[PDB]
Amino acid sequence: MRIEVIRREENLLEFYLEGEDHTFANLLTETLHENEHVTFAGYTIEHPITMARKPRFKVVTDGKITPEKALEEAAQKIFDRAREVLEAWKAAIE
């Protein structure tokens, strides 16, 4: 996994996330949408049919939070929710 910053301007970050694909990219983008201060989050796939395949994200905020902080908040939510779901799963099966 590696972040490559493609573009920066006021309240805007565009980046590649090498090593990832639809699974994380969709979950991250949908989680970002929960944040009222995120005015856009989306991704497209670059190099879709070679080994260079990677998602290209764009994240835009209203300025009350940075794209980077929105991204960290969304990723933390994913971590926390996966943790909670794993605990519930283990409770059901072991």
Partner: protein
């Protein structure tokens, strides 16, 4: 307030309701299972002899598609960077007779065909087949050979059928016949869709009036089958751990921007 309810366990498979989540998470769980959860599979084959009726390439493909036991207690299957450990599955055979998956000899007993009865290729008298097949960890997103199974999922819903609907009795009967929970009141029957429901054509006109399907918010019914590399419950556990590992590493990479 996340909960799981295990409904049914069947050969190589499981059906459960997960509640207190949402559509993006359900989508992510399904995708992670299909695309990210790793298994051992034959990845490269060195043929030394092949007098059979079939191409090397066809036999190599059949070997790739044999589900191999994948020891989740030995290797970290939620690791972002998978162990590059290679297992050698070897065969040295002469006809006449069918070559089965069970005839493969593994360098590592923990990694071998889960099913010993899969036919690979028939050999006639005098025909030899000798190869070393190399198995490694990989992911379904790279090649289908590494996909650990199949995932089916749906909204948990309640189908409401007003008793104003002529022959609503047939719908109660159909639901009962297929093991779907039915609750009956004076006004209606309500069918819980722990499986798909197939509305007979006769009742389609009543959709939006007498018949209404109401999604149970945050609840989803999953049906998961393993190919045999991993127990089906372990597949789910690994998938959830993988989402934790990915999110954790992404946060670490974000911190490098700061710098």
């Amino acid at each position: 307030m996340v909960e799981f309810k295990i409904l049914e366990k069947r050969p190589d498979s499981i059906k459960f309701i997960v509640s207190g989540v949402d559509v993006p998470f359900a989508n992510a769980l399904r995708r992670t299972i299909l695309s990210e959860v790793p298994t051992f599979a034959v990845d490269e084959v060195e043929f030394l002899e092949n007098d059979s009726a079939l191409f090397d390439e066809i036999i190599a493909h059949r070997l790739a598609m044999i589900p191999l036991t994948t020891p989740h207690e030995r290797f970290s299957l939620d690791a972002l960077e998978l162990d590059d450990y290679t297992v050698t599955l070897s065969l040295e055979a002469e006809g006449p007779g069918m070559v089965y998956s069970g005839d493969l000899k593994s360098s590592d007993g923990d990694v071998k065909p889960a099913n010993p009865n899969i036919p690979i290729v028939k050999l006639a008298e005098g025909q030899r087949l000798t190869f070393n097949a190399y198995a490694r960890l990989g992911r379904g997103k790279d090649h289908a050979k590494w996909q650990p199974g199949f995932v089916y999922y749906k909204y948990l819903t309640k189908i409401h059928v007003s008793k104003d609907v002529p022959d609503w009795e047939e719908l109660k009967e159909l639901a009962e016949r297929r093991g779907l929970p039915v609750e009956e009141s004076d006004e209606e029957i309500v069918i819980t869709t722990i499986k798909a429901f197939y509305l007979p054509r006769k009742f389609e006109e009543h959709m939006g009036k007498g018949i209404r399907e109401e999604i149970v918010p945050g609840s989803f019914v999953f049906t998961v089958e393993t190919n045999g590399e991993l127990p089906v419950e372990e597949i789910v556990s690994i998938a959830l751990k993988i989402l934790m590992r990915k999110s954790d590493r992404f946060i670490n990479e974000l911190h490098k921007l700061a710098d």
